[PDB]
C-alpha cells in the first residue's frame, strides 16, 4: 500500500520490542542502517501497519509520502513521540494582531536532540523557550513538520507566537511543482494539512497556518490554504501572506503582507533585513534559519 | 478496499462475459437483482477490481463512494459506457458571457434510456438536443453525474450551453453536511471533481462548473470549487454562483449571481419565476427538473 | 450669488429685529408669506448674507441650493437654530456592531414643533427619546437634514442609535439623477456632506452616514460616500448599504446589507416586513416613516 | 472673487487688443512683468472676467487657484490656446491592455515653445511625436496640465499612449496635504478634474487618468479618482495605480500595479530601472522627466 498516493490511510480516525528486517526512539541511532542527510501514534515516520497510515510527523523506511518530505534533515524512521483571546487578521493588507501592527522577530526551530536525534525531550523545550525569549525572539516557526503538542502549551503559557508548518515540501523534484500541480497527490496533502489543523486549532500561541516551505505555484497547496480559512477563519494562512525563499528578490515577491519564512542563514545582510522590516509596513518580519544545528548575540542586538 | 474513504484508487492514472455472485449494459436489467429508486473504464458504478477504483460515472453494487451519490435515480451497477472562443466571467457580480448578460433557459437532463436504462445511445442525444432547441432551451445541465463525452461534442457543434455536474450529493444523510464537513471524505470528493475537470475542460459548450446539487455549507466542496478556479480560470464554479434548492426562499439565498439549479418541478409558478428572471438582473435563469422521466409547450411559450 | 451652483460659500470656515422685503423662529409663522408643502449660524434656510452661504440646515426664501432640498416638508425660511467605544463594520457583507449582528428597529424623525414649526425645543427631544425607547425603538434617523447638536448628545447619553442624513434629495426633478450626474452640482453636495461629517463625527450614537433619501444612480453621491469612508473609516455609509425606496421590489434591490430607509408608511405589511427582518440575515431592519406628523402600539408589539 | 476657494466659476457651462494694469500669447513675453520659475476659452491662466472662472489650463496673474498649481515651470498668464477600440484594466493586480501586459516606455512632455513660451504650435507637435516614436517611446504623459486637444488627435492617429494629468499639485505648501485634506478645497479640485475628464474621455490614445503629481495621502484626490472611475469605467485612474515620487524607495511604495510617473531625471540608474521594469511584473514602466527643457540616445538603447 506504500506505493500509491491514492492509499492515504486505512481505518484512521480524526485528530517496546523491536526487530529489523531487510524488507520513542530511532532505530538508526542504536544502529540498524546508515542515516542520510483508541490508540494514538504520534510521530511515526513514513508508513506503518488494524489499519495503515503514511502521514509522518502528524514501520517502513521508504514510502509514498516520503516524496512530500523533501526537506533538509537527517533521515531516520520509527516511533518519534508518544485557549486564549487574540485576533490575527489581514485587514487593509496589513497583518494586524489585536489592533496593533505585528512585527515577527521569529526563528525557525527544528525538533532535534543531540543524542536521541529527532526524538524530543521536555527540558530542551524549556531551555529553548528561555533562550529564545532572552534573545529578543517573540515568534517560533516549527520547521517543516508540526512539533510535539507540549511545545504549543509551553509557548502559550510563556507567551510565544507559533507559526504551524504542514509537512509538505518538494525541494528535490524537478520541477518542484510536479507533485503540487498533479491532482493525484491532492489526497495526501489534504490528509497532511487537515489533521494538523484539527490537532493544533485550539492553541492561542498558533497565529499563522503555513502550507509548506515552498513547492510550486499552488493548485493543491491553496486548496488546503483556504480549507484552513473556511475551517479556521480566525488565523491567517501563509504559503493572505507571501513567503519568499531566501530573498536577496524582495522586489519580485512584492511585485506579484510579506513574512520571510527563510532568511539570514546561520548571518550576512541582517542589518539591511531588519532596517527593511522596521521601515516598510508590509515587511512584517521573518524567521532566522535555523535555531539549532542538525549535528546569537547579533540577533539579540538587531531585535 | 471498498469500505474506507481513504482508499480512493490504486494505480489509476489521470483523465464481454458476465457472472453474478452474492458477494455497456446493466446486469439488473437482464435480471440478477432488484433495482431500487492504457485501458479506459468510463461509466463503472461503485467499485471494481491491475488496480482498483470507486469513482463511478467519472464490479461491486455497494461501495464506500455510494454515500456521495445520494441522488434520486434508479440504482443499477456495471459498465455503463465505453475548442471554441468564448469567455464567461462574474464581473461586477453579474454573469457575463462575451460581454452580454447571460440568461439561462436551461433544463436538467438525465442519462437515461427506456430499455437499456442508465446506458446511453447516440440517437437519443440527437433527438434530445433537437427537442431542447426547438423548445427555446439554450442550456442543459448534466444532472448529478457527468454525461458521455460525445454529448459535449454534440452540444458544442450544435451550440448548446452545458453546466457540468460533479457526482457529489448527500440528500439522505442527517445532517447533510456530515460527509462534507469531515476531512476524512475530502480525498474522495477531490478524486471525483478533479477527474471531471480534467476530462471536460476542453469543451466550449461547458460554461459553468457545478460542485453538487447541495450537500452542506461547504468546507470540502469549496476546496474543489476554487481548485477548479485556479486550475481552470476561464469558467465560473457554482454550488461565484449561488444555487438555491427549489426556492419558493429566494429572499434567503439573495440575502446571504443566482441560477436556479433546481426549479419548476415537472410546473406551477413558472410565470412568476420567468418574470423574476426577466426583471431581476442577478436572477439569470434556471434549470427545469427534469427533461425526461425515470421510467413542454408551457416551457416553450415561457421562454 | 444665489443663482449659480459654483458659488457655494464666501469666507465660510470649517464646521433680533426682523424686516421683510419683496426681494430662532420662522417669519412665515408670525405671518409674512404663505407656507407651501467666530460667529456660528446653525439652521439658516436657503441663502443669506462678511460672507455668504447657501448650505441650509447644516436671508432669502429661494436660492440655488433649494433644488437639492426636494424633500416632503413645509417650506419656511429664516434662522432655525442657535465620545464612546463602539465599532460598526460591514465584514462578510453583514452589518456587525461590536461583534454582534445589528437589527435596526428604527424610526424616521422630523425636526418639527407644533407651534414654532421647524424650530426645535429641548423638552420635545426628551419626550421623543422616551417615547421611542418605550415603544421598542433602538434607532432614529434624522430625516432629510441633520438635527440639532443636542439631539446627538441626548441620544448617546440615553443610548440611541443615530443615522445621520445629508440634506441632499431630488424627488421633483425629472429625471431625478439630473442634478447628481452633472459635475456642476458636485461642489454644493460636497459642501453639504463634508460639513455634516465634520460636525457629527464625534458622536458614538451616530453609527451610519447617509448620503440622501434617493436621487439617482450615483456619480456625485458616491464621491461623498467614500469621502466619508476615507475621512471617517469607523462608520459605514449608506445610500456599503443599499437603501430601497418604499420597497414592496425587495427582489430588485437584493439582486443588484440592506436597511429600509423608508418603509411602512404611517402601516400595512408590517408583519411581513418584520418577519423578513428576523429571518433574512442581510435584511437588518428599517426605519418607520414617520415619527411625528407635519401638522404606535402595532410597532411596539412588532418590535 | 479670486480669493475664496468656494467661488470656482460663474455661469460656466460644461466641457485682440491688450492693456496692462497694476491691479494666443503671453503678456510677459512681449514684456509687461518678470517671469518667475457659446464662447470657449481654452488655456487661460489664473482667473479672468458674462461670467467668471479660475480653472487654468482646462485676466489676473495671481488667483485662488494658483495654490493648486505648485508645479515646476515658468509663471506666465494670459490666453494660451484657442474613437477607438481598446480596453485597459487592472485585472489580477496587473495592468492589462487588450489582453497583453502593458509596458510603459513613456516620457513626460511639457507644453512649451522656445519663442512663444507656454503657447503651443502644431508643427512642434509633429516633430515631437516623430522624435518620440523614433526613440522607442510608446507613451507620453501630459505633464501637470492637460495638453491642447489636437495633441490627443495626433496621438490617436499616430498610435501613441497618453496619460492625462489633472492640474492639481502642491509641492510648495508645508505640509503638502494641507490643501488636499481640507474640504474647503474640494470644489476647486472637482472643477479641475471633471472638466478634463469630460473634455478628454473620447480619445482612444488616453489610457490612464492621473489625479496629480503628488500632493498628499488623499481625501480629496481619491474622490476625483473614482468619480472618474464611476463616470469613465473604461480607463484606470492613477495617483488602481501607485505612482512613486522619484523612487530610489521602491520598497516603500511596493509595500503599501506601479508606474513611475517621475523617474530618471534628465539619467543615472536608467539601466537598473529598466532591468526592474523587464523583470518585475508589477513594475510596468515609467515616464522620463522631461522631454524638453524649459528654456536621448541612452533612452533609445534602453527601450
Numbering used by the authors:
A (entry chain D), B (entry chain C), C (entry chain B), D (entry chain A): 15 to 29, 58 to 65, 87 to 100, 140 to 151, 159 to 167, 188 to 211, 330 to 486, 497 to 505, ...
Give the exact sentences the study uses for this entry:
Here, we reveal the gas-phase structure of β-galactosidase using single-particle cryo–electron microscopy (cryo-EM) down to 2.6-Å resolution, enabled by soft landing of mass-selected protein complexes onto cold transmission electron microscopy (TEM) grids followed by in situ ice coating. Native mass spectrometry (MS) is based on native electrospray ionization (ESI), in which intact proteins and protein complexes are transferred gently from solution into the gas phase by the application of low electrospray potential, using low flow rates, aqueous solutions, volatile buffers, and, where appropriate, addition of membrane mimetics. To enable a detailed comparison of native solution structure and near-native gas-phase structure, soft-landing native electrospray ion-beam deposition (ESIBD) of protein ions directly onto cryo-EM grids has been suggested.
3D cryo-EM density maps for the native ESIBD and the plunge-frozen control sample were obtained with a resolution of 2.6 and 2.3 Å, respectively. The three-dimensional (3D) map obtained from our data shows the structure of the adsorbed, gas-phase protein ion, which is remarkably similar to the structure obtained when using conventional, plunge-freezing sample preparation. The local fold and the integrity of the subunits are retained. Differences are observed at the protein surface and in the relative arrangement of the subunits. Native ESIBD led to a compaction of about 10, 14, and 20% along the long, short, and intermediate principal axis, respectively. The size of the central cavity is decreased by 40%. However, surface-exposed areas that typically interact with solvent have poorer local resolution, suggesting local structural heterogeneity. Overall, the architecture of the tetramer is maintained, but largely consistent variations in subunit interfaces cause a compaction of the complex, during which formerly water-filled cavities and grooves reduce in size. On the basis of the close match of experimental and MD structures, we conclude that the observed change is mostly driven by dehydration, as it is the only effect considered in our MD simulations.
